[PDB]
A paper describes a structure:
The etiological agent of RHD is rabbit hemorrhagic disease virus (RHDV), which has a single-stranded, positive-sense, polyadenylated RNA genome of ∼7.5 kb. Mature RHDV virions are spherical, non-enveloped particles with a T = 3, icosahedral capsid whose outer diameter varies between 32 and 44 nm and whose structure is defined by characteristic, cup-shaped depressions. The only capsid protein present in RHDV, VP60, is composed of three domains, which include the N-terminal arm (NTA), the shell (S), and the protrusion (P), the latter of which is further divided into P1 and P2 sub-domains.
Here, we report a pseudo-atomic model of the RHDV capsid derived through a combination of X-ray crystallography, cryoEM reconstruction, and molecular dynamics flexible-fitting (MDFF). In addition, the resolution achieved in the RHDV inner shell (radii between ∼130 and 150 Å) reached 5.5 Å (FSC0.5) compared to 7.0 Å (FSC0.5) for structural features at larger radii (between ∼150 and 220 Å). A model of the NTA domain of VP60 was built based on the near atomic resolution cryoEM map of the RHDV inner shell. A complete pseudo-atomic model of the RHDV capsid was then built by docking all the domain structures into the cryoEM map followed by MDFF refinement. Furthermore, comparison of the MDFF-refined model with the initial rigid-body-fit model, showed that the local cross correlation coefficient between the atomic model and the cryoEM map improved from 0.473 to 0.634. MDFF not only improved the fitting in the loop region around the 3-fold axis, but also closed the gaps between B and C subunits at the interface. Next, we compared our current structural model of RHDV with the previously reported backbone model derived from the 8.0 Å VLP cryo-reconstruction and homology modeling. Comparison of the three quasi-equivalent monomers (A, B and C) in the two models showed that the relative positions of the P and S domains correspond closely to each other, but that nevertheless two significant differences are found. First, the NTA domain in the previous model extends to interact with the S domain in an adjacent subunit, whereas the current model shows instead that the NTA domain folds back onto its cognate S domain. Second, except for the β-barrel core motif, the loop regions in the P2 sub-domains differ completely between the two models.
Residue numbers in the entry:
A (entry chain B), B (entry chain C), C (entry chain C): 45 to 569
Write the structure that this text describes.
């Protein structure tokens, strides 16, 4: 690999200003560590990095201080384990012009080998292979990448009882490394925007809540079979495929049709429905009124209760009138459906759907009119039998989504998870119940604070489509990793387990950074 | 001019560190030739080319092996003369970022004159005008342009038809030219050039098919009125505006209404329809289902057959059970229409339309159902009564388009072309034609391996919106040029022509690389 | 051994007159790796390769540019060890014309030992054994072989499952290696290697389709009983024994007899047949018409449907007039049979057979005519009653073959494979299945771009009848090898397996070049 690049790092002028500083470059300090197991395949990539000053601790804080950089940086690797262990690793410096993934053939680029038995550390100096121009802390332009790959797999002769060893990574800047465009310290560009700050501990401990139910988040729920979600959900492209803005507020739809069933004008069950694409007061999407639940309706016939329906309180409002008609005000079961008045069927897709309401108990005096509005409150309560507390609501089938929505499915051994929260439940009027309030797990895709920050800031040039942004969770007994995708869905490396993970013994959350999607999030509980 | 700069290029070049290949390249190799006539006016530009590793053919093969390039290229010019013809051309090396087109004069540039009376070739070195920045082979950036323009008019002493001579160009890399970043010439796909591979000899010869009727390409059809195409179309930005898959696939639509009109349940024409924009089971877009024809319907009255209709074979398919109805199996006209079920009228706008199907002959027993599905085969036949019929189908007026689709209209003397194929026609019981095939012409806007390849790999930033990518088609006798826009339309230089070009006597196809879109593409057949 | 011959090669080499490329090739590049276990017996041959410009990847790219080659190649071997395992391998440079296979011993050859306890790589030069005759790049002739065989058995001190280690090979061209006859690296097609291009990553990924049902390839199916295929099949000799075109094309047969059996002219099953070997309007061979299925008929009785029948949609077409009959339009079973019109029995021999068609449902009015034509579409559907049905179709017993067609039967542990795809099934009015696709498996013997490419360019004398051309298929987790015989069958190394291999998690495909056919192809998935 090149070495004349240093003369080119060498060129200065008006970026230097006064009084440049070598800073500390002398010794090697801990950047990172990686694990190598007998499990891992030849041609698998254990460690990768683009050349940057964010590869020492000292040059990452100086990055705020300086606006531009140039030159080489040295990477030192220490294999720890034993001299009795077979296997070999390959470290190679790759020039820019590349897309890294399944076709990027590490063992056919100029490279050096690292042997597992090495007692002493092995060093590489990584130069600049495009040294002609200063990089800012904006776009650097395309830079060389350092990749370490397994050439032949780790062997223990004493069997499978011990099966992994670690390799340390240490760095120091080289001689040719320099900085420029100092200015004075402040915050700047792409550096200040990262998905990291969305998730944090106080939100999961007790400050945060879900985006479907406004509940307190008690758990993490794995969903092996996948799911799809859009309403009040957001991505790292800054937009939503939903019809709700990211806050809880009343459901107002001005044009629907209203009727009642029982052939009696007083003491009857109220019905309201409308087709999708008439939400004239909603800017987000005219498909349904903001605040309307993303679930398919649940059939009930009087006096029988809906088994795990969404219920909210409200009543019927005509457009000419300043406030709703009181006689109509009652609890309603709400959902998305097709086939109103009396051929009702649930719908999982918004295209050709109908937004439907029916009162769970009798209204004082009904109303027959068309068109006329529906006015129902911000968050809902769960309708379900008396002492019911089985699994969670909605199940993946129950969630309604648009045809623009991308679905959440497993990637590798990484499984999508939903955030589980405590919801109010009711067993139908009076009687008895399993407890004082009863147990009930309502689930959402996201914590509402993450949803507000995806809507607030655009993170497209801040997490790549192949990556997850990763944080690690610490529990009193055990720890795990959790990931957020660019499509807004959250993942865990739990595989096919369904067990509820308890956030109530949560000590901590902290970022691990960007990781590629296929590679498994840690689960040790 | 800039021939001192040999030593100042030699600071920008050397950080890379690589060998010089001199011994192979003693001789110059053929690049192109152009024609010079008595009617080519002074100020006109006959020939232009950008600096690129693709100018010498052997350097193009070597470009594959390397990820960067730099240094100059020599150009050598031969005038074919006579010695009795007067006139001159001017050769200038144009700076980077100076727009090329007919507005461009050589007037105030450094230049050499190329003389009509010359008998000796005249050799210019084209130096590197970017040398501080090494160029990538697969993302190069901005380069200079070599331009040749007519200073003085070609004049002949005598009469006759004889009015033209040719000027040949051959090239050789200079002693400053260099390849660097060998790495692994291992597993990159588009090292080979992405745009250039779209058209090839055996593909235009007999391997290729067209992307709308699946026929064999016999010819090229100019459309001097211009035209528009959205479906099964891709482009050099990777984007599309269609609904149908990149390959040909069968029609399955689960959600329609079926009915018939008449005085009886039997020996009637079956009708089925569903709305446009409702196909939520199509991954590409909801405009219609996959396999659905992008040409407007043909109204007809029982018992008569539609002409220049798209007909396909299929039947009514039960949505609840998932299974066909045999009695319904018949040939059907499938099309886009508006005014369903019974006020039907034709449109070319998808929005607010209905995708409609009607049988071309009597079904034994019809069915009235809602909902019911439609299941029809992939392949399509043109409906035409006995012998002599319509010139080519679809005509540009028949084609439907969806918002976002740009239309292709002539530029200068370049006119947009469609690809013509021989297609199967059926129409009217025991009909016949004047020929055995019954010579019926189906047209597509692209060849299908091109539609598939432009959907499989990226092509962005390779061709400039002012330029066309050019290939030269070579016949046993004569040649012509064909061009590709950024948009993914093909163009040819026949001007106000409607005449069909016969591709039967094709020997070869070669890439000519980008050329300005106002440059006429030559026609000598 | 033969390392004196440096100066005697230098008379045979020099008449050509060319430069030496040294500066690019400082380092060695990855060629392959193989596995060494406690169960690989002494005398066994683990790895073999012929001298060829295709061993180093960058030399392969350069081979394109040149029409001849000569000189040696260095080979470098790394044992992955541990230091507690005993055993040895022997490395010999084998003379030209000495047959390779398991009968081959290293016993009396010059050799080096490669040691289990080795920690340092061991490097052999493979000299040119042909130097008086310069080799062609695109017709090379006879070369020597490098062979590695087990001298002493791998032994472990301890128990556990741990029983294997790997040995890597990397190569570098020698200082004697040379390229000559640059000419024009211009316009030769198969400069690139003809055999190697047949299988590619995006082709096995999602661009390829199979050559009998036109479906998407999901898997590989081993057939440990062996099988035979003639139609739409080509080979590495360019020869075929089929009737149908290299692409999928519609059935048109002008000369048949049509009849029905029953008690009435209406609501009957139409039957049509013509003899095999009579299709004089088919350019390829008169065995049947173009588009006709190469699987034996399925007898059925009215009113029941055939199972695992080939069904296609079409009708009776008037031979005198050249035009269809609408009333006859229906779904038909098309097949090869013997015993027509009414003693019909199935066969797999074409000679003395009849190509037969029978409708699967009632036609409104039937026709009795002689002669009358048959006109049916290209695409085909599998006939199956409701849900659970046959494992794959065609089964090897159903396939018809014509004289001259060789059958593919296992060799050693390599077994012949068919390519599996998901195909459309229809059968029995308003039927259904357990899944929405109704998971029906269609099989082809080759991928269709391979059938088309093996018909488009020549391939003779590239692969030796004892060897198989090998490609390596690489997955996200594990890898396997696939092989191609001279005959144009594909093979895999699953032995007595019938289990279907799922190609869903494929990352990559790379050519491994020829290997002896008795060599097992590896399976680690």
């Amino acid at each position: 690999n090149s070495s004349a690049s240093v003369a080119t790092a060498g060129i200065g002028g008006p970026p230097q200003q006064v009084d440049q500083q070598e800073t500390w470059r002398t010794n090697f300090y801990y950047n990172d560590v990686f694990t190598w197991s007998v499990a891992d395949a030849p041609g698998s990539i254990l460690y990768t990095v683009q050349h940057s000053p964010q590869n020492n601790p000292f040059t990452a804080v100086l990055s705020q201080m300086y606006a531009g950089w140039a030159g080489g940086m040295q990477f030192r690797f220490i294999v720890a384990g034993s001299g009795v262990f077979g296997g070999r690793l390959v470290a190679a410096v790759i020039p820019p012009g590349i897309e890294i993934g399944p076709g990027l053939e590490v063992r056919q680029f100029p490279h050096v080998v690292i042997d597992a038995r090495s007692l002493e550390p092995v060093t590489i100096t990584m130069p600049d292979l495009r040294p002609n121009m200063y990089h800012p802390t904006g776009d650097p332009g395309l830079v060389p990448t350092l990749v370490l790959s397994v050439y032949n797999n780790l062997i223990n002769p004493f069997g499978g009882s011990t099966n992994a060893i670690q390799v340390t990574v240490e760095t120091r800047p080289s001689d040719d490394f320099e900085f420029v465009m100092i200015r004075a310290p402040s915050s700047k560009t792409v550096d200040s925007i990262s998905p990291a700050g969305l998730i944090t501990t106080p939100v999961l401990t007790g400050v945060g809540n879900d985006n479907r139910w406004d509940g307190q988040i008690v758990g993490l729920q794995p969903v092996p079979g996948g799911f799809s979600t859009c309403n009040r959900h957001w991505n790292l492209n800054g937009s939503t495929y939903g019809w709700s803005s990211p806050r809880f507020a009343d459901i107002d739809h001005r044009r629907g049709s209203a009727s009642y069933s029982g052939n009696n004008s007083a003491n009857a069950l109220q019905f309201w429905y409308a087709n999708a694409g008439s939400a004239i007061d909603n800017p987000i999407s005219q498909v349904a009124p903001d605040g309307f639940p993303d679930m398919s309706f649940v059939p009930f016939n009087s006096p029988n209760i809906p088994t795990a329906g969404w219920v909210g309180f409200g009543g019927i409002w005509n457009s000419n009138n300043g406030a709703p008609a009181a006689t109509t005000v009652q609890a309603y079961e709400l959902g998305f459906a097709t086939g109103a008045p009396n051929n009702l069927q649930p719908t999982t897709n918004t295209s050709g759907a109908q937004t439907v309401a029916k009162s769970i108990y009798a209204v004082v005096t009904g109303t027959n009119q068309n068109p006329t509005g529906l006015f129902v409150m911000a968050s809902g309560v769960i309708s379900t039998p008396n002492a019911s507390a089985v699994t969670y609501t909605p199940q993946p089938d129950r969630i309604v989504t648009t045809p623009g929505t991308p679905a959440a499915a497993p990637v590798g051994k990484n499984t999508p998870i939903m955030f589980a929260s405590v919801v109010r439940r009711t067993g139908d009027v009076n009687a008895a119940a399993g407890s004082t309030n009863g147990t009930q797990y309502g689930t959402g895709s996201q914590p509402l604070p993450v949803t507000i920050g995806l809507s607030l800031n655009n993170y497209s040039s801040a997490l790549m489509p192949g990556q997850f942004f990763v944080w690690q969770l610490t529990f009193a007994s055990g720890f795990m990793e959790i990931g957020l995708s660019v499509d807004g869905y959250f993942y865990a490396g739990t595989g096919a387990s369904t067990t509820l993970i308890d956030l109530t013994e949560l000590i901590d959350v902290r970022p691990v950074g960007p990781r590629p999607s296929k590679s498994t999030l840690v689960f040790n509980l």
